[PDB]
Ligand binder design. Structure first.
Ligand SMILES: Cc1ncc(COP(=O)(O)O)c(CNN[C@@](C)(Cc2ccc(O)c(O)c2)C(=O)O)c1O
Ligand SMILES: Cc1ncc(COP(=O)(O)O)c(CNN[C@@](C)(Cc2ccc(O)c(O)c2)C(=O)O)c1O
Lengths: 465, 465
């Protein structure tokens, strides 16, 4: 293609995208295809001569869309939201056009420099302690990671290098491998699987701290684990404290866990992948209190701050602690990959085109809708809410057996009107209702509950026979 | 933004992108800004109320573009090409609109299933051994990684897990840490820094194999290193053999190194980040002979196959060896991150809109232009070519001291008409000329050489005084 043909086809793509978005409520949210559906429907080899754009876009509708789960349908209530906004889409077109690989300052100065400023913009919107901000001064700063899973790995690796160097400074004869045998990392029993994966990749032991009745990590359980493992000869070195657990959006107590991690020389990484976006609202900022004790803090604008994937935001207090693993000129030693694209354009466009107040309104509407769903559940005594509703997630279930709730879930996902996923809280099977779509409204939440309520009656009937 | 506003602004963005691309030859390839230029030019905090699109796009031109290194200018001859094509741009708009996170089959079936087919399309274009292809049969298959640096890490981690399990099967009392002390990985002394980083992240020793006069890894040097390290008690477990080294586009000998790695139970990873795209042309496929001995093979469509970053293509012979670290339903255990976007749409669009013959013509034009530059250098006896020219890279220098070539480079990069970077080959400072832009032509290559030739005269004059 030349640029003149892209002028025509790019504008046709813009219309196609806007059409898909404007009609998305008419899409079945979860697909009917079975695993393996796609390969029989397209050729076994690439074409030798070019295909037409018309044939390709026809295949998008005919072959791709039947296998799409529509994350941005208002009836998608699964997992956590992922971001979809037109400002991020516009920036992503510009990002691909500039097309730089920012593995060094010289590879495109603006790619690195805009990113550092946007991470300070974001840090200030979250009212982060100044130690995390760059502002061309001090030792802290922020970087975009590809994902919170990668951000957790990066923090673990930095923590690993820091403790190896400290332990070898104390015992110069001590090998890296002898230290490796004794290192242990911690997270909540509600932590995301990215923590377990970081421990496996990092080659260290990982232990779950039992959570309290609110599924929060507390000082007492942490102290009990530390006493046990230190007596066994393990060396605590890394902690992931979670704000907004994937299971039930619970919150680890940083005011309790922070001081303990500091005094134990445990690198404290705060994972707020989903919940972090709400901390731009002052009524939720208290859930972040204690981040001043953290060594690193991470959350995903690409979940709940309208910056399309990929965009994970990570700050550290000491750049030097992170690199070994004022002006920031490159990010090579802040991330796993060397190459990176101009992702800060997406943050710039979203922040500027929505404004801080526009993002706050977006968060608050989602939380209000969550409370609307919760209100409906609390009116039906056949159901129970298992965890306090704070952000855009409601954990609910039919009172009674796990089997009846497994049946309810299977009826919901078989009817394919809405989409949600479950979790386990201890031995209890629980349904999750996550407010996801940028365009979801009260009417969608109410119809989803009406649907759930109807299927529950059929399921409860079948259990008495 | 709503969809109706995106219809208007998205089409204005398409025009802006096409304008930038059509005028790109008028851009100064390398910028005049100094590190730190950007922060004083934009506000210290995000705006509370929205800014206009017009103000944002004005800032792109006023503030961002002065800090852009124009990778896609025809006068960019630095590093290696990165991909920029309009089919990939169109697919990337559709990718952001579908906006799924494909961390599981259910999160969007098409996101995983198209990817597996495209990796077979690509594998067949490279005439890979069938053991690497999926085709819903056997044990092999391919995945998109975010980068070759990540692909190398993933292979090292899989190799690490495989050798730990084998050594523990032989000695059940042996701890992971005791094994960690003895593991050693290998690469060429010309290997990319991503290998050293994978070794650091993976917690294993890494040793460089001395390259021959053609900067290739050969059996003799590999055998000499193996005898030394095995006698010292090290356990060889991982090898990165490079096809198309970053320094001088040299090629490790897989026909020699492959059988050695197999008999030593060394996981052989073939890194062809840049050169791999040329292997779709039969006249270059012989440079890949011996990949049948590899356990994993990787190259970057986002360098030299017009699939905009990010898109790194990695194949393995045994999915089970990779996951522990027929139908493919998820890629969670193939990559470092859990989340991933619908990147295979970019491969689909590029492959279909260019056709295999269009991609072959693109490769061959770049190689011809490389040989055109080489021809000009070989006509000037003040210069020498340090390594055989095979693909789109020419390694050249003024005969004489490193200091005179350092002066030549500084004059080139100070005049800001073209952009190139150097390397070291042993103790020798060498200039690299890489054919990069999709729209580069003979006329650009000839003007670049005319420029280099002129600056060399001034530099040689200043050395005789
Ligand atoms: C609490 C928590 N911590 C870390 C991560 C990992 O984030 P990332 O995907 O960027 O590596 C998560 C992941 N949330 N995983 C979900 C909710 C799936 C998901 C939804 C929306 C997204 O934008 C992403 O990236 C993932 C899951 O089902 O596991 C997390 O919740
Ligand atoms: C031989 C070789 N192996 C691995 C890598 C790493 O690839 P990736 O960037 O995907 O992690 C490379 C990297 N090449 N690095 C260049 C040539 C910079 C560069 C140019 C164009 C790109 O598309 C990327 O991603 C990077 C460098 O200067 O180091 C490699 O050459």
């Amino acid at each position: 293609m030349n640029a003149s043909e892209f002028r025509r086809r790019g504008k046709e793509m813009v219309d196609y995208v806007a059409n898909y978005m404007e009609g998305i409520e008419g899409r079945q949210v979860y697909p009917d295809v079975e695993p393996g559906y796609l390969r029989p429907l397209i050729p076994a080899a690439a074409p030798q001569e070019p295909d037409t754009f018309e044939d390709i876009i026809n295949d998008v509708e005919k072959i791709i869309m039947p296998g799409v789960t529509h994350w941005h349908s208002p009836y998608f209530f699964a997992y956590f939201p992922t971001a979809s906004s037109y400002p991020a889409m516009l920036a992503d077109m510009l990002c691909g056009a500039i097309g730089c690989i920012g593995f060094s300052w010289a590879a495109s100065p603006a790619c690195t420099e805009l990113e550092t400023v946007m991470m300070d913009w974001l840090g200030k919107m979250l009212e982060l302690p100044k130690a995390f901000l760059n502002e061309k001064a001090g030792e802290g700063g922020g970087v975009i990671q590809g994902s919170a899973s990668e951000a957790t790995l990066v923090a673990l690796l930095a923590a690993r290098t820091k403790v190896i160097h400290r332990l070898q400074a104390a015992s110069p004869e001590l090998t890296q491998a002898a230290i490796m045998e004794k290192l242990v990392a911690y997270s909540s029993d509600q932590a995301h699987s990215s923590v377990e994966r970081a421990g496996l990749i990092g080659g260290v032991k990982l232990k779950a701290i039992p959570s309290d009745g609110n599924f929060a990590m507390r000082a007492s359980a942490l102290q009990e684990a530390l006493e046990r493992d230190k007596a066994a000869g393990l060396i605590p070195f890394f902690m992931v404290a979670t704000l907004g657990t994937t299971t039930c959006c619970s919150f680890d107590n940083l005011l309790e866990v922070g001081p303990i991690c500091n005094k134990e020389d445990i690198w404290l990484h705060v994972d707020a992948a989903y919940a972090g976006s709400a901390f731009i609202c002052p009524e939720f900022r208290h859930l972040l209190n204690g981040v001043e004790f953290a060594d690193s803090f991470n959350f995903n604008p690409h979940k709940w701050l309208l910056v399309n994937f990929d965009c994970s935001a990570m700050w550290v207090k000491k750049r030097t602690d992170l690199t070994g693993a004022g002006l920031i000129t490159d990010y090579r030693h802040w991330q796993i990959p060397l190459g990176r694209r101009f992702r800060s354009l997406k943050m710039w466009f979203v922040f500027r085109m929505y404004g801080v107040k526009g993002l706050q309104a977006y968060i608050r509407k989602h939380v209000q809708l969550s409370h609307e769903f919760e209100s409906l559940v609390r009116q039906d005594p056949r159901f129970e809410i298992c965890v306090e509703v704070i952000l855009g997630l409601v954990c609910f279930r039919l009172k009674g057996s796990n089997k009846v709730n497994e049946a309810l879930l299977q009826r919901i996902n078989s009817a394919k009107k809405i989409h949600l996923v479950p979790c386990h809280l201890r031995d209890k099977f629980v349904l999750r209702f996550a407010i996801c779509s940028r365009t979801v409204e009260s009417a969608h939440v109410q119809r989803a509950w009406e649907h759930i309520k109807e299927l529950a009656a059929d399921v409860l009937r079948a259990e008495r026979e």
